[PDB]
Design an enzyme around this catalytic site. Sequence first.
Site, short mmCIF file in Angstrom:
data_model
loop_
_atom_site.label_atom_id
_atom_site.label_comp_id
_atom_site.label_asym_id
_atom_site.label_seq_id
_atom_site.Cartn_x
_atom_site.Cartn_y
_atom_site.Cartn_z
N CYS A 433 48.70 -9.70 52.23
CA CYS A 433 48.29 -10.98 51.66
C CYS A 433 49.69 -11.59 51.24
O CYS A 433 50.49 -11.77 52.17
CB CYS A 433 47.21 -10.95 50.55
N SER A 434 49.90 -11.91 49.97
CA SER A 434 51.05 -12.48 49.25
C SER A 434 51.84 -11.30 48.56
O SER A 434 52.85 -10.86 49.11
CB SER A 434 50.55 -13.50 48.25
N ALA A 435 51.33 -10.71 47.47
CA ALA A 435 51.96 -9.52 46.84
C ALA A 435 51.55 -8.21 47.53
O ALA A 435 52.21 -7.16 47.38
CB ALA A 435 51.64 -9.49 45.35
N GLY A 438 46.06 -7.42 45.84
CA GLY A 438 44.74 -7.87 45.40
C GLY A 438 43.78 -8.02 46.56
O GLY A 438 42.92 -7.15 46.79
#
Length: 502
Positions: A433-435, A438
């Site tokens: 995803c992004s990080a 989550g």
Amino acid sequence: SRRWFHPNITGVEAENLLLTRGVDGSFLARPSKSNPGDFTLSVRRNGAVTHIKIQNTGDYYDLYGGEKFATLAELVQYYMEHHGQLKEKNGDVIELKYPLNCADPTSERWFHGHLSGKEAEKLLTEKGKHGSFLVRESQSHPGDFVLSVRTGDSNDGKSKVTHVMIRCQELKYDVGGGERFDSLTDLVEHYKKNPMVETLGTVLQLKQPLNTTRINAAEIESRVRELSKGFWEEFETLQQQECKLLYSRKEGQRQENKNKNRYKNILPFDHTRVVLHDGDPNEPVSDYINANIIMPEKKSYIATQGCLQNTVNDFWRMVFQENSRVIVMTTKEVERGKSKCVKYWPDEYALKEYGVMRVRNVKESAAHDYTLRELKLSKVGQGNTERTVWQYHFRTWPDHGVPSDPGGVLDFLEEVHHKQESIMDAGPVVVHCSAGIGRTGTFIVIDILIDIIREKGVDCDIDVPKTIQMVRSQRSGMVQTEAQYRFIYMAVQHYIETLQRR
Ligand SMILES: CS(=O)(=O)Nc1cccc2cc[nH]c12
């Protein structure tokens, strides 16, 4: 330990606790009782209390005037070992020195609250094993507690259930003699280390809490009905276990690796990080990417962050090295005007070199919830190294929270699964995803759970929090929010229902 988190405290209860029982540098964290994903870090400085907001929309814990973190325990560990780093709006340093401990037992795995002695004996008889235990309310002696423990080796009297009365006297707890404890947790931890011995010699070993979360998959609908009346309490019990997962992240902390992390404190565990081999001899540290192997404990995954402009070459090196043939992207490139993952693939029909790797985008196909890109990856100078990599780009996940219906995610994961299964000797499925904690953690846990049900059918055991804890031991903070936790249950329920209809 995580005793500094108080799950059922108001702001004014937090102020009064820090003013009456704390000193300057004392702190605690707590949830907001009406805005899940909102937390507050309450800190005492110069004889007054400051409240600092921490927001989690699903990707990371974002501390106001501080950093982004994978877990509240990692946040607290960072600042308790970095003075001068946490600062107010007007710039002064806020020091976290002294956790203010919570006595509340409601997030302990062994705590059952209102529960009958016959109900506890049945649970411990059916589900329990040697050393299984729980703590419940007495019913006979109000305000007191009972610890029930199974010890033993057919129902042939080789095992038994013992009840130990726990008195609560003036807000301290005891088993009838010896030490008086500030909380039930302190009592349980003591008698876990120093077990009670009976007169005739039986050791009442507190080996493990009674397992209440393992369910038969067929009965998911009933567990969901029950949790919907809570999901919050079961999620907070899981979050209490995160202090056991403060594994080292030294490689990600090296100066040579700092600019390869999207967020400086969201780092891969050393023990499961993807190690990159065959690096540029001229690059001093070329072995590092912010990515971990997730091995369910046959299909494995790599959980990683969205690429930075300076990590795109390392991303393709990882894909190639690990023989991955399927990538799952769970963010748009840009959300809320912020870059979440750089474009690391060519335009349709184009060929690009990413360092030593060459990628062709053969064809893109759009579906309602996702785009599939058929990519060909090879090493420059070595034609016969080409393999197809199928990139599944999920495009409809909302900017905050979770999808209202899981049907889209489930159809996507079914298609991803079938592609992976069709390719002989494919490596781990890459999920980002992004990080990379989550949404990535959510997609991976759903996939793991559904895989059990795919092989064993509607009648098999699943345990959502135990599966999440196991994935969290391999990368920090996998599954970020109560909303994602609920979505995991909803997805598995929807999957079971569509399987029954078929
Ligand atoms: C109450 S329980 O012990 O049956 N379930 C449970 C809850 C939270 C975290 C974990 C880890 C393993 N099991 C967990």
